[PDB]
Design a protein around this ligand. Structure first.
Ligand code: MG
Ligand code: MG
Ligand code: MG
Ligand code: MG
Ligand code: MG
Ligand code: MG
Ligand code: MG
Ligand code: MG
Ligand code: MG
Ligand code: MG
Ligand code: MG
Ligand code: MG
Ligand code: MG
Ligand code: MG
Ligand code: MG
Ligand code: MG
Ligand code: MG
Ligand code: MG
Ligand code: MG
Ligand code: MG
Ligand code: MG
Ligand code: MG
Ligand code: MG
Ligand code: MG
Lengths: 133, 233, 187, 199
RNA sequence: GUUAUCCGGAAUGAUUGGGCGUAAAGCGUCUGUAGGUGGCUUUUUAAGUCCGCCGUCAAAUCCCAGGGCUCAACCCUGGACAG
């Protein structure tokens, strides 16, 4: 648990590859925000919170299998960019865009977390958390 | 259109139970329901929706004029299939299933050519002019060709709908229809994976009663669909 | 019920003999076959070297429909032919853009062959290496960048290219998946 | 620096080349030996495309190359921009206005100072023509005579809509920049570009 | 055309961009000093990070836009992204 962000991302990727809709993730401001964003983008069905023994679990419903489990044309990819060993930052004009914009990029900036779209409207650069296909 | 199903009849014929919990495929864990005495109990509220959709597409496909196969190779399911197929006037496989029946058509059809020559031979009465070795040999040809080509011997052309009993033992049928672009409407017990069929109906394996229930429902759908394709063309 | 002899001779006359009927039907399929590679493979027997030809061949309409196929025979011609059929039954479709290029940038992996495709500006032509280039050219992609990294083997690179252009998502469909209007993702 | 070799030959191998020869080739008489290379390597195809281009316009390779660099520089579709550049050449606009028999003739004309661009004498073939430009004959007897007899005795009226011609003084006028459909040959520029990826 | 020199192709020293069960490659196994990374919540600060404005990073070169030697190479004016 040296990195929480990468961990969330990873659990998602694993549950996804295994064709399961439901994931338990540990909550945190970052986690919660990231998931919110993930919802307003439409990458994930629904999110909700649970509590036991002062632990918080966000469970995430995931988009249903593609017209069977066997014949899948599409998966859902996640990639950590800035990680504890190398922190990647970008100014306004270097802000990444994924596959011509089909995917998104998550930024942590002065005004909070957002997508690259929001950064382009508001004109801010910052730290790039991950890429999402 | 409606079909005949209720919780009470499916409770009657014994559809709701399946093989022991040592033997199960967790791939089926989403739509299973309970577990009793180390005997699994499969969800019937899913079973009714799948059986409804199955009889619906069976009705549309019968009405448009498409051709039907049915398959199970078991001991009881074979005696049930000859009669299911005669009652719906369809093509069947009960006895030993030959690899390549669907996928390799050309050689299967030449095998049918020579089986037809054999059917003309035997009724012509020209098997009485032969040495004893020749009649015993032509009778080997006959015995075999009847076993394998018995229920399909009417069909000319590639069958576009296939119906199947218990996909565990039926692997090659599933493979061949997966390959050729054919839909499979299949019976699932707790041991089988729900990849291999287009419409997979949760069902029972060991029971002759479940086989008869779901197969009579389906052959009734094919029968009313047979009235609708006797009308539409 | 009409007699069995006349109706079974009707299914015998409708399915034609392979010894009395010659074959060229293929240009009516609207396809073109392009031979990528011709190799002489060998099985060895107590007598000596038993020689065969392996042909790797792709088919396309140059209209956005393409496939790969592999075949084996004693003669160049026959293997070519088998390759043709195996390809035709294996065939798929490449997502295209109004300018005849790719939706986006993509990688692919098949065996030790890795393949890099990225969209281009109109008028750049197709720049790539043998397998990837023939596949893409036969698909009809007009402007494409590609480089095979990893291995050089023709066949694997072909299959990898197919894997690439198969996973390509066109914008309409990501709009439909995400559940968001096109113009919102455009920005 | 100019191609003085046999034309008909390059015509046979490459294809139909307007800027070279008006005489249609012989039946070809290669049907005796029936000698072929088998088929053509992709490379040979691309090479013959480029060769087509180059020999139609009378250009040297090293020249074509720098044209191509100019092309890759310009912002827009590469092959198209290239074809523009090749088609705005002076001896070429001279030819395509029918002021000349062929491109070698037009080159000869330009070279001997028989032409004027905006009342200024330009004797170099590769002069690049720009919009709103006057193509005139020099006012001397011989210049007029050449331009007249080569203009009138050739019946073709194809003039590709960016080119104006006026009757008595014979004032040619370049109106605008070429359109890709108005180009002077049948070529997939894509192929020439693909050949030049390696320079 | 040949030879020499350098970069390329070479993902063949790999940040972008590789590997280490059997192909070259996991110290024989631990304890631990420097060193690197390090869970959650609230506040602070503002070193990084981000945005705006200013100074400068000479002219020539490269990039864009015109102009001049008949064209081009070359020359001249004006201007700027980077960083
Ligand atoms: Mg900086
Ligand atoms: Mg074989
Ligand atoms: Mg690998
Ligand atoms: Mg390489
Ligand atoms: Mg010579
Ligand atoms: Mg290069
Ligand atoms: Mg030299
Ligand atoms: Mg290097
Ligand atoms: Mg080395
Ligand atoms: Mg290596
Ligand atoms: Mg060894
Ligand atoms: Mg070793
Ligand atoms: Mg060890
Ligand atoms: Mg060792
Ligand atoms: Mg040691
Ligand atoms: Mg230690
Ligand atoms: Mg320490
Ligand atoms: Mg610290
Ligand atoms: Mg932290
Ligand atoms: Mg300077
Ligand atoms: Mg300039
Ligand atoms: Mg000038
Ligand atoms: Mg300057
Ligand atoms: Mg600065």
């Amino acid at each position: 648990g040296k990195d929480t962000i990468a961990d969330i991302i990873t659990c998602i990727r694993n549950a996804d590859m295994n064709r399961k809709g439901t994931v338990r993730i540990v909550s945190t401001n970052i986690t919660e925000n990231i998931v919110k964003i993930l919802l307003r983008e439409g990458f994930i069905e629904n999110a909700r919170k649970h509590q036991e023994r002062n632990k918080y679990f966000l469970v995430l419903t995931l988009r249903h299998r593609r017209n069977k489990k066997g014949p899948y044309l599409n998966t859902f990819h996640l990639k950590r960019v800035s990680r504890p060993g190398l922190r990647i930052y970008s100014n306004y004009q270097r802000i990444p865009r994924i596959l011509g914009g089909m995917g998104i990029a998550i930024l942590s900036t002065s005004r909070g977390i957002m997508t690259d779209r929001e950064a382009r409207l508001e004109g801010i650069g910052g730290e790039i958390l991950c890429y999402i296909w | 259109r409606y079909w005949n199903i209720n919780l009470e009849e499916m409770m009657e014929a014994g559809v709701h139970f399946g093989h022991g919990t040592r033997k199960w495929n967790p791939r089926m864990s989403p739509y299973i329901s309970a577990k009793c005495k180390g005997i699994h109990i499969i969800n019937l509220t899913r079973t009714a929706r799948f059986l409804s959709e199955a009889c619906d597409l069976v009705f549309d496909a019968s009405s448009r004029g498409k051709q039907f196969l049915i398959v199970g190779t078991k001991n009881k399911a074979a005696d049930s299939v000859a009669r299911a197929a005669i009652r719906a006037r369809c093509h069947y496989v009960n006895k030993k299933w030959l690899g390549g029946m669907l996928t390799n058509w050309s050689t299967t059809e030449t095998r049918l050519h020579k089986f037809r020559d054999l059917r003309m031979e035997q009724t012509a009465g020209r098997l009485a002019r032969l040495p004893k070795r020749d009649a015993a040999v032509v009778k080997r040809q006959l015995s075999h060709l009847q076993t394998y080509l018995g229920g399909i011997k009417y069909m000319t052309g590639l069958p576009d709908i296939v119906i199947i009993v218990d996909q565990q033992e039926e692997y090659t049928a599933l493979r061949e229809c997966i390959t050729l672009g054919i839909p499979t409407i299949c019976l699932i017990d707790t041991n089988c994976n729900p990849d291999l069929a287009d419409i997979s109906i949760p069902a029972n394996d060991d029971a002759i009663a479940s086989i008869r229930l779901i197969l009579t429902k389906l052959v009734f759908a094919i029968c009313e669909g047979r009235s609708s394709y006797i009308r539409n063309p | 019920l009409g007699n069995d002899v006349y109706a079974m001779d009707s299914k015998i006359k409708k399915a034609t003999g392979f010894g009395s009927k010659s074959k060229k039907e293929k240009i009516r399929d609207g396809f073109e076959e392009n031979v990528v590679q011709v190799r002489r493979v060998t099985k060895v027997v107590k007598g000596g070297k038993h020689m065969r030809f392996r042909a790797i061949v792709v088919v396309g309409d140059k209209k956005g429909q393409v496939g790969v196929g592999v075949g084996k025979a004693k003669e160049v011609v026959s293997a070519v032919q088998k390759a043709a059929v195996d390809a035709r039954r294996n065939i798929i479709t490449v997502p295209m853009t109004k300018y005849l290029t790719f939706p986006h940038r993509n990688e692919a992996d098949y065996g030790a062959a890795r393949v890099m495709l990225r969209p281009a500006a109109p008028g750049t032509g197709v720049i790539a290496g043998g397998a990837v280039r023939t596949v893409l050219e036969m698909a009809g992609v007009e402007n494409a960048l590609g480089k095979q990294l990893g291995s050089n083997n023709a066949l694997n690179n072909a299959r990898a290219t197919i894997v690439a252009v198969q996973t390509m998502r066109q914008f309409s469909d990501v709009a439909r998946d995400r559940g968001i209007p096109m113009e919102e993702l455009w920005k | 620096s100019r191609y003085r070799g046999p034309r008909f030959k390059k015509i046979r191998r490459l294809g139909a080349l307007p800027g070279l020869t008006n005489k249609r080739p012989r039946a070809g008489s290669d049907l005796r030996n029936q000698s072929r290379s088998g088929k053509r390597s992709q490379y040979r195809i691309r090479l013959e495309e480029k060769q087509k281009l180059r020999f139609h316009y009378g250009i040297t390779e090293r020249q074509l190359l720098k044209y191509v660099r100019i092309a890759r520089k310009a912002k827009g579709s590469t092959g198209q921009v290239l074809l523009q550049l090749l088609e705005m050449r002076l001896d070429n606009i001279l030819f395509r206005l029918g002021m000349a028999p062929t491109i070698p003739g037009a080159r000869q004309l330009v070279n001997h100072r028989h032409i004027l661009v905006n009342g200024r004498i330009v004797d170099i073939p590769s002069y690049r023509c720009k919009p709103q430009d006057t193509i005139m004959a020099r006012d001397e007897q011989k210049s007029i005579a050449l331009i007249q007899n080569s203009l009138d005795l050739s019946p073709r009226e194809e003039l590709p809509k960016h080119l104006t011609l006026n009757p008595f003084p014979y004032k040619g006028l370049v109106n605008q920049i070429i359109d890709s459909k108005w180009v002077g040959l049948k070529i997939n520029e894509l192929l020439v570009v693909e050949y030049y990826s390696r320079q």
